[PDB]
């Protein structure tokens, strides 16, 4: 069985988060899957994996290495599944590197971003400031959204690995080039 | 003259204002004046008007009113400028109308929503909270920012008034159904 000890997993890891966020852990999961067998890797592992990524932040671990052996995973997997959790090596892990990471790009990236601007209390762009670093960071370095794009995100399509992963987080660069230019352009006159 | 009247308050406007923004003011001016011509308006009085459309919020009106009069603008111009500053009647008035609405609309509209809501502190989107009202508006009606775009945002276009408006009130609605689109299919896969 594989199939079915994921549809248990995917429930408990939406309870235990219906009590505070999830959709995060849906939408990487569903990526690093298709992503997954695009590499022909272990779609279980990487599944699973990108399933419990995000729940960690000992016997944190423990709990799922042992929900797990309960489930039949063989030793071999179970001690390969979260052998990526924690180091986020093999291929299945760089499946759910990007995963994770490609979720910070796109529409939904776009609007994260103006998102934690408004809540940060920042501006949303601003002109007059220059375009970037290490300990002002976010330690005082006073930042924009929009440069928030040229600082990190539209640097990520490198940091991919997955030739699948480059392929997608390609197609998700340009959509922010395409709306981070009909900004400006309707910014300006 | 006329034209310089204008570079004369779009530094006094600019200046009483970098002592806090601005920028809405001045796009929203520039709108006004492209849609002003296309409708073959007094381009003028619509672009004073745009100016200080915003700064009111009695002697804030007379401040002006005075300045104005030092400009030379004859009566039934000076009369009909801020005529239309606080119905916000006449054409030029509802250019100066278009114009400060089709800024909800567009990029810089799906930017600031996002940003505002991240404000809020509410959620960019939650698919268990369905779409939508006057009390509850904004006095406890929990909502999110993707929501906002089918409350408020979205039916824009035809409160519109010039023709031109809905123009350009329609490409604006487009590229936003483009990216609430792109949005929801990133959403899940």
């Known amino acids: 069985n594989e199939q079915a000890i994921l549809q248990s997993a995917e429930a408990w ?16 999961t569903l990526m690093a899957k298709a992503i997954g067998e695009q590499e022909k890797v272990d779609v279980f592992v990487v599944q699973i994996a990108a399933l419990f990524h995000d729940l960690i932040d000992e016997t944190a671990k423990q709990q799922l290495i042992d929900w797990m052996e309960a489930a039949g995973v063989p030793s071999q997997k179970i001690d390969h599944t979260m052998d990526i959790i924690n180091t986020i090596a093999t291929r299945e892990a760089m499946v759910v590197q990007d995963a994770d990471r490609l979720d910070a790009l796109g529409a939904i990236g776009i609007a994260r971003t103006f998102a934690y601007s408004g809540n940060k209390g920042q501006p949303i762009y601003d002109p007059e400031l220059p375009i970037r670093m290490t300990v002002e960071e976010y330690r005082h370095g006073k930042s924009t959204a929009i440069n928030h794009f040229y600082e990190k995100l539209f640097k990520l399509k490198d940091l991919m690995n997955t030739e699948t992963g480059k392929q997608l987080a390609k197609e998700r660069h340009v959509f922010m080039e395409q709306f981070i230019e009909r900004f400006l352009s309707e910014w300006n006159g």
Do not use: A, N, P
């Open 13 to 28: 890891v939406k309870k235990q988060l219906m009590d505070e966020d999830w959709y995060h852990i849906r939408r990487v």
